[PDB]
From a paper:
Mupirocin, a clinically used natural antibiotic, inhibits isoleucyl-tRNA synthetase (IleRS), an enzyme that links isoleucine to its tRNAIle for protein synthesis. AARSs catalyze the formation of AA-tRNA in two steps within the same active site. The amino acid is first activated by ATP to form an aminoacyl-adenylate (AA-AMP) intermediate, followed by the transfer of the aminoacyl moiety to the tRNA.
We mimic the motif alteration by the exchange of the first and third motif positions in PmIleRS2 that naturally carries the canonical HVGH motif. At the level of the overall fold, the WT enzymes and corresponding GXHH mutants are highly superimposable. The insights into why IleRS2, but not IleRS1, can tolerate the non-canonical signature motif came from the crystal structures of the pair of PmIleRS1 and PmIleRS2, both in complex with Ile-AMS. The coordinates for the latter were taken from the mut-GVHH-PmIleRS2:Ile-AMS structure.
Author numbering: 1 to 1032
The structure:
């Protein structure tokens, strides 16, 4: 073993260990050495390469590393291939800001290929930043040969999946009303929309719709989106609902019967009752006549019209509502659109042309009143969808898109999810399960440039569709030569046309790229270029035994994985999911926010070490709920856990070399009770940590280990230092080294998945082997002594009670005290075995165990004025004083009898009720008491001259021992000590001359009145001059 003497920072140690991993290929060998062992299949969720890693990203990568390392140590081969997510809006928008451009026109003017080259350069910069962060965090994952979603092989496997889906008829193009981002200028998927809801406050209005061929008759239409009014095509009523023609003032309004008293206030008279199918066909005048509807502006029947809200008459604009689109299409009404792709009004609405529709709400109200059509307005606080990337409000916009028909397999989705073990369990039928139950088809087409091209070619002649699964299939159908090096990106694939197999017409690729979530959801099949390569390796690496990512993936990777795999293969791609809560910064969620909530993880790793950061993330709180994180918790983890292990390890190394201990040599072992306790605590910790890890309880396993580390340092090592400091290699010293060597080897093995750097530093120095190539230690039940653990735990509580009393009464442990009395309610612990430990630790001359406190307490009596005040009238204070005058035995008799009589000064004797007297139990004179309820510790706090002088003698002994180290004197050299002090020190030294000689290797001791050129030292509140003249 090597030394720990030269001061090494945490960063220096981890850098040294990392280089040791590099030169030994330990990560690679920890996988190869498990060849033939059962597989544990793990998929890495690919971080988006669009920003710097933060501290919040260290939680997931720590948890993944713990599982992989732990599963490797318990006899599994865990292949770990890193991945980077490089396509889509999360990358495109960032690059646009770097270039100072925005929108599809700016990108096309910039040049599609030039813009894409900027995307490739940006993601490459972030991959290196992420890779450096991952390596220094100690998350072992293969970033030398990662899967990257922009690589041609990866995209080709995505094409094969999409083509196979298309073969099943589950990839279709359709004109549907979809969630749409006017800024990004593309439709969005259902899971993307579920990530961008915010509370808004807008206006829902009621508008008069004057009936045609009638006078003073106005329909009362209702809408939550006033900006859709210029595009009105129809009014919807429920055919079986009841409506009334009610006159109000000079006008007559048509409104639902059940809502009339709410819509019409002040004064109205109901004339006639009508059903919904009677009002069907009635025409009216639009609130805005800017646009013309060739077949529309009538009243139609829709079954979703509710009488609980609104007026029972609903304005329908087919281009901005799925229900509106359906009903208008059913009745053969004209489809009209007044909004461009940027969310702005077209020329068909002159007064607001070129304005965002959701910004015209205020002006729409004014135009309504000025045209004599407005009737009501009310506030609406509701959740509204916003773009999950650019935070723009979304619109529901009729648009032609490509869909994956996930609803066709919805039953298979739910079946696959039911086979998944979720952590926490509530995600399974909660956040994830509810999303599955409300499934709509997956809108995958994005009118963007950087992403996986949607591999569907349509014939210009007959609209026949061809979806090449591969470059070879693309080459086979192409009307021109397609080189083998064709890059599966825009615009390169846009220059490939195919000859139609039906009519020999020209087939052109649809221009869109696919949702970025499809890329990552395809990674089980695309990370190994399946089915083009690695068919056998893919089979051994599917499905995953676990994945672990943040809770946002329930609307992300968790869903896209499930959807791609179910559509492609029908099977669940994972057996188990760890859904991780998000890391917070004292409040908000860490992210690439404007505030930039996240801290620099590399700076923290540099300052406190990756081990400390990982331990804080694992032990401070569980990973399932939102986690407030602080640098302070990392600092505490470094000093309490990591530094503690290093010191104990360095303590073992220093004295093993000095004593020449060799674990390969055979010694005589006189193992003490403290050795048996810590060994029992070691294997009990091994058992309980393993049980937690088997159930993915990292927090509980870490906390169990931290308890053992505190016991190892504060109790076992601290109380065994003399055996390491002693001179001869006797049986008890050999037992100390043997015990501590086993503790360090096994504890480092226990800690390897948690704190891989410091664990390997201890293990490799002690054993010559990497801890990460080792087996996870097994519990040796024969070394578990439950009684010894129980008794020692009681001893620790008693010691803690004794320290509490000494601290309370300012009695430093260096000052011996006469006795400690322990009142145990029951004879449970064999206290005789631990008498020497308790007396040493608390510095008491006598330790006595009592069944009760009758000899250790007394009673004083008082009066409860709230109870007995009025009863005794004015003699109350005389009675209260009379109770306080009572003897000790009189007070004790009262608590037994429960009845007492006080004799006042006048000779009058008054009887005291039980509830009239307040009882106080006080410790005997000179004693002090602390109790937890199970154990009551009574400490004799009274000091005698002999106790004070012994304490002074102890301080003199310590002062001499410290001045001896300062002079660098040999350990074995009898000194001639000269000592000067006042009479109190002189008397104490004289009286305890034997004690001083037993603790100091003194050839002579001389008490001089004054000392030439002496060293003044502090002995309590006194100054003592010392001087050492080496014997000749
Ligand atoms: C599985 C990864 C997805 C396919 C996608 N590339 C993605 O979300 N990539 S990421 O880089 O933004 N996220 C990386 C991981 O970090 C989690 N995460 C993101 N934000 C936080 C946060 N504030 N606290 C804790 N964990 C968080 C993600 O869920 C993902 O596991
Ligand atoms: Zn957007
Ligand atoms: Zn054709």
């Amino acid at each position: 073993m090597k030394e720990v003497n030269v001061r090494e920072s945490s960063q220096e140690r981890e850098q040294r260990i990392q280089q040791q991993w590099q030169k030994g290929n330990v990560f690679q060998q920890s996988v190869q050495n498990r060849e033939g062992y059962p597989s544990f299949v793990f998929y890495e969720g690919p971080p988006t390469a669009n920003g710097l890693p933060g501290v919040h990203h260290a939680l997931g990568r720590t948890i993944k590393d713990v599982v992989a390392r732990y599963k490797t140590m318990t006899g599994h081969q865990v292949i770990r291939k890193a991945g980077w997510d490089t396509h889509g809006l999360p990358v495109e928008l960032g690059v646009e800001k770097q270039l100072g451009i925005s929108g599809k026109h700016d990108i096309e003017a910039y040049g599609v290929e030039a813009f894409i080259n900027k995307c490739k350069e940006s993601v490459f910069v972030y991959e290196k930043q992420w890779r450096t962060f991952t390596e220094q965090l100690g998350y072992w994952v293969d970033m030398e040969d990662p899967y990257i979603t922009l690589e041609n092989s990866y995209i080709e496997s995505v094409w094969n999946v999409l083509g196979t889906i298309h073969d099943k008829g589950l990839l279709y193009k359709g004109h549907r009303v979809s969630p749409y981002c006017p800024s990004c200028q593309t439709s969005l998927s259902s899971h993307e929309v579920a990530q961008g809801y915010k509370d808004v406050k807008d206006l829902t209005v009621t508008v008069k719709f004057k009936v045609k061929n009638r006078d003073n008759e106005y329909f009362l239409g209702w809408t939550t989106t006033p900006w859709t009014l210029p595009s009105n095509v129809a009014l919807a009523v429920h055919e079986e609902m009841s409506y009334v023609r009610a006159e109000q003032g000079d006008s007559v309004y048509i409104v639902a019967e059940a809502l009339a008293d709410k819509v019409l206030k002040g004064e109205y008279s109901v004339l006639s009752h009508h059903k919904g199918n009677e009002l069907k066909g009635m025409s009216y005048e639009p609130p805005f006549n800017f646009v013309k509807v060739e077949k529309g502006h009538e009243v139609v029947t829709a079954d979703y019209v509710t009488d609980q809200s609104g007026t029972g008459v609903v304005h329908l604009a087919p281009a901005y509502g799925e229900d509106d689109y359906r009903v208008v299409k059913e009745n053969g009404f004209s489809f009209v659109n007044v909004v461009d792709e940027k969310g702005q009004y077209t020329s068909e609405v002159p007064p607001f042309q070129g304005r965002f529709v959701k910004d015209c709400d205020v002006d729409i109200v004014r135009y309504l009143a000025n045209q004599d059509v407005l009737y009501h307005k009310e506030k609406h606080e509701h959740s509204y969808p916003f773009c999950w990337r650019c935070d723009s409000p979304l619109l529901y916009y009729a648009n032609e898109s490509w869909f994956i028909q996930t609803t066709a397999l919805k039953e298979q989705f739910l079946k696959n999810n039911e086979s998944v073990k979720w952590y926490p369990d509530h995600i399974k039928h909660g956040r994830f399960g509810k999303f599955l139950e409300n499934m709509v088809d997956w809108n995958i087409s994005r009118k963007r440039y950087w992403g996986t091209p949607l591999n569907v070619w349509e014939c210009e002649g007959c609209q026949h569709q061809v979806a090449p699964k591969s470059i070879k299939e693309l080459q086979k159908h192409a009307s021109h030569y397609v080189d083998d090096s064709i890059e599966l990106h825009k615009p390169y694939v846009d220059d490939v046309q195919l000859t139609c197999p039906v009519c020999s017409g020209e087939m052109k690729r649809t221009p869109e790229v696919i949702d970025v979530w499809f890329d990552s959801g395809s990674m089980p099949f695309a990370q190994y270029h399946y089915p083009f390569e690695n068919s056998e390796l893919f089979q051994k690496q599917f499905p995953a035994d676990v994945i672990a990512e943040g809770i946002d993936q329930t609307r992300g990777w968790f869903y896209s994985l499930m959807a791609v795999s179910t559509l492609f293969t029908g099977k669940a791609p994972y057996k188990r999911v760890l859904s991780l809560g998000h890391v917070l910064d004292e409040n908000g969620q860490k992210m690439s926010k404007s505030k930039g909530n996240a801290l620099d993880p590399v700076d923290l790793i540099h300052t406190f070490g990756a081990d400390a950061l990982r331990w804080a993330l694992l032990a401070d709180s569980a990973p399932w709920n939102p986690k407030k994180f602080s640098e302070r918790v990392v600092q505490e983890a470094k000093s309490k856990v990591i530094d503690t292990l290093v010191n104990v390890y360095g303590f073992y190394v220093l004295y093993a070399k000095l004593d020449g201990y060799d674990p390969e040599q055979t010694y005589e072992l006189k193992k003490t009770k403290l050795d048996e306790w810590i060994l029992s605590r070691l294997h009990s910790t091994v058992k309980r940590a393993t049980v937690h890890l088997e159930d993915y309880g990292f927090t509980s396993a870490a906390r169990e280990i931290a308890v053992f580390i505190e016991e190892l340092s504060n109790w076992y090592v601290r109380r065994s230092r003399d055996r390491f400091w002693s001179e001869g290699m006797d049986g008890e010293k050999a037992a100390a080294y043997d015990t501590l060597h086993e503790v360090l080897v096994t504890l480092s093995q226990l800690l390897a998945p948690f704190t891989p750097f410091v664990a390997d530093d201890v293990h490799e120095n002690l054993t010559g082997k990497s801890v990460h190539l080792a087996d996870y230690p097994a519990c040796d039940q024969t070394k578990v002594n439950e009684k010894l653990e129980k008794e020692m735990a009681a001893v620790l509580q008693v010691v803690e009670l004794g320290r509490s009393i000494r601290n309370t009464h300012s009695l430093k442990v260096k000052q011996p005290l006469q006795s400690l009395s322990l009142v145990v309610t029951e004879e449970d612990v064999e206290w005789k075995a631990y008498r020497d430990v308790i007396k040493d630790e608390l510095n008491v001359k006598n330790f006595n165990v009592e069944q009760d406190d009758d000899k250790l307490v007394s009673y004083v009596l008082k009066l409860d004025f709230k109870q007995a005040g009025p009863k005794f009238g004015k003699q109350v204070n005389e009675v209260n004083q009379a109770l306080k005058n009572l003897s000790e035995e009189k007070g004790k008799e009262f608590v037994e009898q429960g009845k007492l009589s006080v004799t006042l000064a006048s000779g009058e004797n008054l009887t005291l009720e039980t509830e009239d007297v307040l009882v106080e139990k006080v410790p005997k004179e000179g004693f002090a008491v602390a109790s937890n309820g199970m154990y009551t510790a009574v400490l004799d706090t009274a000091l005698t001259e002999e106790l004070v002088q012994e304490g002074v003698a102890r301080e003199v002994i310590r002062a001499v021992q410290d001045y001896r180290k300062k002079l660098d004197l040999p350990v074995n050299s009898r000194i001639n000590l000269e000592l000067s002090g006042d009479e109190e020190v002189q008397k104490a030294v004289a009286k305890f001359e034997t004690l001083l000689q037993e603790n100091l290797l003194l050839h002579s001791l001389s008490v001089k009145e004054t000392i030439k050129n002496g060293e003044t030292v502090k002995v309590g509140t006194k100054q003592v001059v010392l001087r050492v003249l080496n014997q000749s």
